């Protein structure tokens, strides 16, 4: 079994200093063919050379760069050796929904995405009064379907009395945490009626001024 | 040394007519026969041989051919339309915007410049095409023997040279000017040149002046040519010939709007520069030595570009296209009232005209001698009666007497051209009686046909001493019948008896019966009429008296009919003049005819009333009084005459030109004058060119008068001048309705842009949205307001004037009042609109975000208020009811509904290109509510008295 000596794990902070990851193939009796870096199972572009000792440099380390890296060694007639260098950073929410405006009795969905390893756990908290309290499933209409990064919340049969408010999405990992807020609007069914009663309330005014003046 | 040069300059017998012609002839030269000896010609077999050298030497006088004008090509019309005061400025702004769009010192601009250029191209193309089509339509409507060597031979007209000896007969058209050698009582009609309705008699001594273009009506003679080419009286006037009142007002408004926009741009640039200077220099306190060199200049250039951007918003770009389409529509509508407009800029002038100068012969009268009232059988009819009024054989006797007495060569024929008055080819005064007979529904042709010239026994011809031509025949029976017509008193003195009543022929008594006929005839001549009477005589069968004896045959006549002959006024002229005078217009008559006929027709038409409050002059005494002792036309002398002058008689074309010029140029009155001139003759050529508007009679007008005019009356109806006034006041209204609607969009847009550039950093109204609002929607809005039908209540106002501003006080009140409401609503929706509608505020965006519902609501509301202001823009006075007559115009409703539907489509399915987001149903009814509030605010505005 080939021996690979890897660099220590690096935690990506707000520092702008570049980060270098190292693997050293100290012992190998097989004729090496090529090697490459991989992140989350995906080969990084332009990392295939001879590289008996290979380096990968991150010039602007960010939360999106952090992940489970590997330096794979492919030989002519030997099994590949992968090893692992884990890069950890606090989660950073990339995209969300600013607001969800929906009418009564439909389905409303809100989503949040995050980046960085380890993959964060998601907590949804509606803003009850001035504090963020956890939502309650006391009506059987809330569905939280959380995946590795994607996290969706669905509400069915929206009610104007309780549903409207602010919903917070939380992502927490070993290092840090971040959150975003979304405001949900539920519109009444008789909403178009009020402008209609005002449109013909000024038509009556128009056909009284003109006909009195003749 | 040199042969006799051109006659009109070196011996000016031309241009000086009357008895004064021979006055100069006798003192300077011989007896009009030595004048031929002066040239290389003789009265008999003149110009002995062709001799091409001699012909070419004589052709230095002229060619006898006037080259026709060359029609202008479409590209030439486009080139002429390009050079405008407004259109040059708009192109400059478009090029500036296009150039500054690409300035990115180390989308926007690409839209405004293209839109401006497209609108300019549309204006140019529409104007050029309309002028080309109108001129091409006009061109379609409009349209002899000489003694060469011994034996007379037909020669083409163009080869006539000075000295030619020409034989002229009846019905001919004179090709060139000349003198009179010898002839048998030539009578010619010079109404188209001189303006005199009376047929002129050319003799060797009284007036031997022959003019080109006049029609010789009776007699034959011999003439020698003197003025061949453009040197003739028609050619001189032809060669003398080659901005509107509305355009001056439009350019003045344009410069005022430009100055206002420039002030706004300067204010915004000053605000930005002051903000930068205050912020940076005070708090940070930069060294200001070398660091500022790139940064400060780039910032100042950016602020200047922002100011230039604000400047373009203020300028109205759809105004020229709106005016052009409104004018084109009005011209097309006016063409159906038998007014042919030629330049598309003359359709408005007649609306604001303050005076009219009218020719008499051909314009106010029919130029045809007719019998109007008649005294027959002791019954005087002021109007021509029906054929069976008296229903006696006396009418048969009258018809036979008129037909046989004279009707040999003088005949009346159908026009042979559809849409024209009946044409006569004989003596004009004689066919008045034939016209009377024809209008009595009796045919004179059978009577004439049965008696040829061979069967005529004796025909005594009208001459100097006889003065009463007569015809005596015998064939119908064994007795003799003689007919004699002539002057009233001349033939009445020889009327021993009179055929009185429907019964038996009574006797004529000079003591008592003469008083009644004098009392009948005197008012006739009082009203300007000419009295002609007819009588008949019978001779005994056995024996036969000596017909050479003129003593007895002249006397012993039985008078049968007395008629009144005149050149009548057109039937529609009196009421047309009455309607124009009520609209604030003053009508004056300028004519080349006598003073008595001019005064009579002026009394009949209604130009003057008895009392002599006004003044009537002649041509000679108008020139003498108009000039000072130095001999120069002084504007101070004209101002004493034209205010009170009503009739000008015996006036040269120069006199008409002088009068029109003096009226136009004078500043003595309170309001400056606009003068229109109506005509049909060549002598009206100059006056029709100097006037602001020129109307030319279509069927009766000549080529010179039709070419110099702007509007042609295709059916020469004087009541179609009143419809030119009412279509010119409707044009001016439909343009001031569009100014009310357009100038309230520009104020709101410029203030929103200024606030979004200075205070905030982005505007709710994008570029393509305002392209849709200003270019496409406002053009259709102007098309809708143009098609409002005119009404006969427009003819109750007074003319406005040359220097009255376009934007009146009520229009200013409307513009300001509606701008206040629109700005208040827009700002309220911009700053607190997301709390009312319960949506996300879209005030600040990262320029990488989809369109917001907060801003689409503002765009939709703005368009809705413009849509509902298109209704308030229909009343430019203080009218409360803006829905009056809305359904008489279906184009208005069609355009409004189409605009609303297209706006719905644009908002719903516009997307990112239009910067629009789809709206809900309840969010759209609020836009309609706010837009409909404009109508309710219009009444609040209208309540405020502008006085
Ligand atoms: C809407 O009203 O037009 C806007 C122009 O559109 C803009 O866009 C300009 C941007 C304005 C920004 C709004 C603040 C305001 O500018 P104007 O054109 O009104 O200003 C002229 C002129 O400046 C004098 O005021 C008057 O001239 P006079 O001295 O003779 O009274 C004249 O009136 P008249 O036609 O009677 O002569 C006015 O019209
Ligand atoms: C790199 O080159 C060396 C020297 O030839 C060789 O031993 C080694 O196997 C190569 N590694 C590759 C080709 O991956
Ligand atoms: C790791 O590899 C790099 C690159 O060849 C080399 O410089 C370094 O000395 C190696 N470190 C060890 C501990 O082998
Ligand atoms: C390398 O092989 C190991 C075998 O234990 C496996 O766990 C790892 O995921 C592999 N790495 C990659 C990048 O496939
Ligand atoms: C809420 O209860 C319903 C009961 O039908 C269930 O389907 C749903 O998954 C529950 N949601 C959560 C977040 O537990
Ligand atoms: C979320 O994870 C999936 C699966 O690994 C990946 O395809 C996707 O790009 C991730 N999304 C973001 C926003 O990082
Ligand atoms: C997210 O969750 C963590 C852990 O419960 C909590 O302490 C924190 O206040 C929440 N918000 C943020 C922004 O981290
Ligand atoms: F033809 Be008008 F009388 F000059
Ligand atoms: Mg005339």
Author numbering:
A (entry chain B): 147 to 360
B (entry chain A): 22 to 127, 148 to 184, 192 to 290, 338 to 1042
Please give sentences taken from the publication describing this entry.
Upon ATP hydrolysis, PMCA2 undergoes major structural rearrangements in the cytoplasmic domains, causing the opening of the M-domain to the extracellular space. In turn, this triggers the release of ADP and Ca2+, and the binding of counter-protons, finally leading to the E2P state. Although the PtdIns(4,5)P2–N841 interaction is maintained throughout all E1 states, it is disrupted by the large movements that occur during the transition from the E1-Ca-ATP to the E2P state. There, the binding pocket is widened and N841 is reoriented and interacts with Q837 instead of PtdIns(4,5)P2, explaining the profoundly weaker binding of PtdIns(4,5)P2 in the E2 states. During transition into the E2P state, M872 rotates away from the PtdIns(4,5)P2-binding site, thus allowing N841 to change its position and to interact with Q837. In addition to the newly formed interaction with N841, Q837 in the E2P state maintains its interaction with D873, a residue that is directly involved in ion coordination in the Ca2+-bound E1 states, but is displaced from the Ca2+-binding site. The displacement of the D873–Q837 diad results in a change in the calculated pKa of D873 (from approximately 6.0 to approximately 7.0), which decreases the affinity of the residue for Ca2+ binding and increases its affinity for protons. The transition to the dephosphorylation intermediate E2.Pi exhibits relatively minor movements, mainly pertaining to the closure of the ion-release pathway of the M-domain.
Plasma membrane Ca2+-ATPases (PMCAs) have a crucial role in this process by extruding Ca2+ against a steep concentration gradient from the cytosol to the extracellular space. Native PMCAs form heterodimeric assemblies with the small transmembrane proteins neuroplastin (NPTN) and basigin (BASI). Here we present the structures of mouse PMCA2 in the presence and absence of its accessory subunit neuroplastin in eight different stages of its transport cycle. The structures revealed an overall classical P-type ATPase architecture with ten transmembrane helices characteristic of the P2 subgroup.
